Amino acid sequence: VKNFIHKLKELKQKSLDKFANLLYDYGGYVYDRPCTFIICSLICCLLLTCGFYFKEHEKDIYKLYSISNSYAYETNETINDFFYKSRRCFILVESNVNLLKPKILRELQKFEEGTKDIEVDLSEINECKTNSELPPEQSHVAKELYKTLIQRSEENLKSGKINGSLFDYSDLDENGKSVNFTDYKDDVFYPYQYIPPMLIKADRCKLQNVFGDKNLNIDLREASDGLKKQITYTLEDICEKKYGDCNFSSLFLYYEKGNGYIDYPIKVDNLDFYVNRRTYKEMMFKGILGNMVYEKSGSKYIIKSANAIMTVIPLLNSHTYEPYALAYEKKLIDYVRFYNLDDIIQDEETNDDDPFIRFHVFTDRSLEDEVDRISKIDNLTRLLLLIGVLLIFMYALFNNVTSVLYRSKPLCAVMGIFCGFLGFLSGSGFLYFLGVKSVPPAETVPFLVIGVGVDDVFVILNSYSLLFMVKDNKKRIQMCLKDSALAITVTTLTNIIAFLISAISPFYSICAFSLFTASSLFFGYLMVLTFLLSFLCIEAKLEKKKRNIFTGTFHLFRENISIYEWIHNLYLFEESYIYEEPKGNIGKYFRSLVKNYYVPFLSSRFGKTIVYIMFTIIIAMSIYGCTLMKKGIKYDKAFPVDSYVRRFTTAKIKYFPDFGDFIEVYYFDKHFINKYRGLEKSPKINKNVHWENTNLQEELINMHNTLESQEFVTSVANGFTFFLNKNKSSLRKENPQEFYEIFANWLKKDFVGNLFKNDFVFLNGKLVAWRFHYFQKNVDDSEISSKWLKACKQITKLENHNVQMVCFHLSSIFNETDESIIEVTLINLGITILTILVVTAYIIKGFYSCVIIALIIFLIDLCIFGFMCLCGITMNIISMVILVLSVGFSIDHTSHIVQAFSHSMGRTRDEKMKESLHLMIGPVLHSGLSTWFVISTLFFSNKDFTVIFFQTLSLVLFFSITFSSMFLPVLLSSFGPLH
Ligand SMILES: CC(C)CCC[C@@H](C)[C@H]1CC[C@H]2[C@@H]3CC=C4C[C@@H](O)CC[C@]4(C)[C@H]3CC[C@]12C
Ligand SMILES: *[C@@H]1O[C@H](CO)[C@@H](O)[C@H](O)[C@H]1NC(C)=O
């Protein structure tokens, strides 16, 4: 096998030589007729860009940024399917004034009424248009079940009688009995005003289904658009109506039915239970108003100066009402965000010492809106991108221009700058043709890609200058493509593979960004090989006739020695005209400057000691930063100042410290769930629970007390505990029928039961599914919030009686994602490391250099992670992806340097390092500077998604330049794979 291994190494080097010869022939062919290649490349790129017409956008936050775990998503789906929720819109009217002055209160009442006034035409709804289709209908057997359920609901509501002797309370078997319609038949449900929401699926297009009060029976998807404009619905039509009037919660409830008086002050008995007996409606003054500097005269409360006022608006979360609810929300936020009552607050007492009525608002879809706030590419960001392109263009022009005009090649720089953008366009169009939609992070796709392309440009140009000796310009270009094409191909392949491995990430945003960027880099490399190379050939031919670019414009208006062999021979001649580069070469001045001071410094043992000390202390700082690790979890999804959602949340925290998240807790009996999930197509953890057991109820009330005991739990609203307290004596007999009947009567008769009438359901009177909600204290730190959620899950377990209470909130998914962000990133980085090691082993002459490459990459990753932790960058998905991407960039640079050293000759390892530096220190530095010039304008951005990206990328680029320019050269000089 050893003979086979050495023959395989010989085959590898022979294949590299064959690749070089093929590129030699390709360069000859390009030199044959550059203009045809130029026009063909341009038309192909235009055809690729034509896919922009087919471009589609993906902007759902959860798809972009979430693990998409089955657990939380399944929990949310189950809650939606088996329970009814109420969408809550909050409108915190914060101020620096009392807000209880009669004039200010009158103005607030104006605003309150106005909210109700808001109306929306039917045409605004996207689903209401006749163009919108109808989703596949519910199962026919499921529809029959829905009909039977609504029929029996009507019959039972008319009857009003509740008894349990009809039901069978025998403990269910594993099959939930003790396909066919009869299986789901006779499913008596309590409360009678309840049907499983999963079976509530009909044609929401019809006006009658959603709004029966209209009495018109029109179908929005089957009617004229103008008539849809004519038909309108107000807030009421889409608002839950407690007591048959309204379910909205606000201070003005106290003023309803003349009980309260705007001019007069307020005095109520209870903060959270004062009921307006005129209206029979209660209100939680603590929840309604915040930062209340009010007084409390014993039982009565002297509400004097409530500097913050909040209002809660409920909306039907039913799938039928969903588009209408979204529409109104949209109207509402605008109604409030553009609302202003500065006139009344003018010339009023202010604690801040000017009045400021913010009118903060928040809705369910508002988060998505803020996602759009960061999804759209800022106009300022586009301007910054263009300025960075101009900066890198100027830098490339400066590098290309020389003392001798005809020898300089500005056109090469210009066409490289253009070719980067053209390759980006080609990749974007190809991905659009593939059908993958765009992502917000793709805002950084163009700029970065451009810079990457420009890198290759430099290398090619370098080779051209390095072949000044060749008199035949055709032969010069042929050898230029013979030499550096392998390096650029390796760089492109490595970047593509790294970005693919990044695309393996479950995150759709990261995957799409990586796929788009990899395709763009591939197309840019292809364009460079044809477009930029053809322009290079044109300019080389112009230089052959000693034609300046200005002179050429005016006129049109009217020795196979290896370059490494050459540099080795030059250094040997120095030790002991051909090696004298002509005046005005592309990189003669820079290479001479490097060879004068930098190369002797790195060759010097004292310089090596200095470099090693510096990098050792850098590694120590990196270790310290990794130990710090900054913050493991983000705070608010990088919510900027220009975010009514974030401002509202800050206001809520500031003025309502006693109100955090409305965490919900659910119990779902396994049998009923499984059955109803099946119809709409440990085992005994929740297989069947005998709730009539006294010990089980004792455990439940104990769990309630324990949850109340927790410092992070503000309060709870477990109605089951209230029922247990009210009817403990009657529950002495553990009869399931008696338990069900008493619970049903309490739900129907007791006003407390009415308050919790929609938190418990009964299949054959067995309490299959129920829930309770609790207010949890607000906190900015998501880590401690996730820990609190885990503690709540543990407390509500009650595994002793074979019970398990699941917990949910909107932030649970975000907390779970921030839990495994680092883990998935580490796994992806490991896969990336494996792929890069394979590639290097297959593209590097020596395996010692391969392991050196691996060590360099590991060290660079450690350093960049430590320094980004030190600088204050927490765990952000942008940081995680840019980690791998800039690792790919750094290993491209490292491959350049390592190939330069390995293919460099020299009797001394230090001499070999010196030759490698003199041959390749230029292109790497130019590439790094170009990329940093591209990304520099992103120093400040509208969203953190861009500024944090800039910080991470700039830091990693600095580290890559430093290592491949200082650490890697000295390492290869003192311990490199000599011979
Ligand atoms: C001992 C008892 C009588 C004291 C008063 C209990 C209070 C604090 C409880 C009982 C019923 C509860 C309500 C039950 C249901 C909902 C709907 C939800 O979308 C918002 C909270 C809200 C509106 C609860 C607020 C708190 C509440 C009013
Ligand atoms: C309800 O059940 C009771 C027994 O609890 C029994 O009298 C009868 O089945 C029902 N009562 C009616 C219909 O009045």
Swiss-Prot record:
The keyword Transport applies. It catalyses: cholesterol(in) = cholesterol(out). Residues 33, 400-409, 468-472, 545-548, 604, 844-846, 904-908, 976-979 are cytoplasmic. Residues 55-378, 435-439, 505-507, 629-809, 871-876, 941-943 are extracellular. Residues 379-538 form the SSD domain. It is a multi-pass membrane protein. Optimum pH is 7.0. Inactive at pH 7.4 and 8.0. Residues 2-32, 549-558, 588-603 dip into the membrane without crossing it. GO terms for cellular component: membrane. Glycans are attached at N76, N163, N180, N247, N727. The chain crosses the membrane at residues 34-54, 379-399, 410-434, 440-467, 473-504, 508-544, 605-628, 810-843, 847-870, 877-903, 909-940, 944-975. Pfam families: Patched (PF02460). Disruption phenotype: Repeated attempts to generate a knockout failed. Conditional knockdown results in decreased parasite fitness during asexual stages. Increased sensitivity to saponin, a cholesterol-binding compound capable of penetrating membranes. Impaired digestive vacuole morphology. It is found in: Cell membrane. Changing F945I: Increases resistance to MMV009108, MMV028038 and MMV019662. Keywords: Cell membrane, Glycoprotein, Lipid transport, Membrane, Transmembrane, Transmembrane helix, Transport. The keyword Transport applies. InterPro entries: Patched_domain-protein, PTHD_SSD, SSD. Facilitates cholesterol efflux from membranes in a pH-dependent manner. Required for maintaining normal parasite plasma membrane lipid composition. Required for the proper functioning of digestive vacuole. Required for the viability of blood-stage parasites. Belongs to the patched family. Mutations in the protein confer resistance to three diverse compounds: MMV009108, MMV028038 and MMV019662. This is Niemann-Pick type C1-related protein. It comes from Plasmodium falciparum (isolate 3D7).
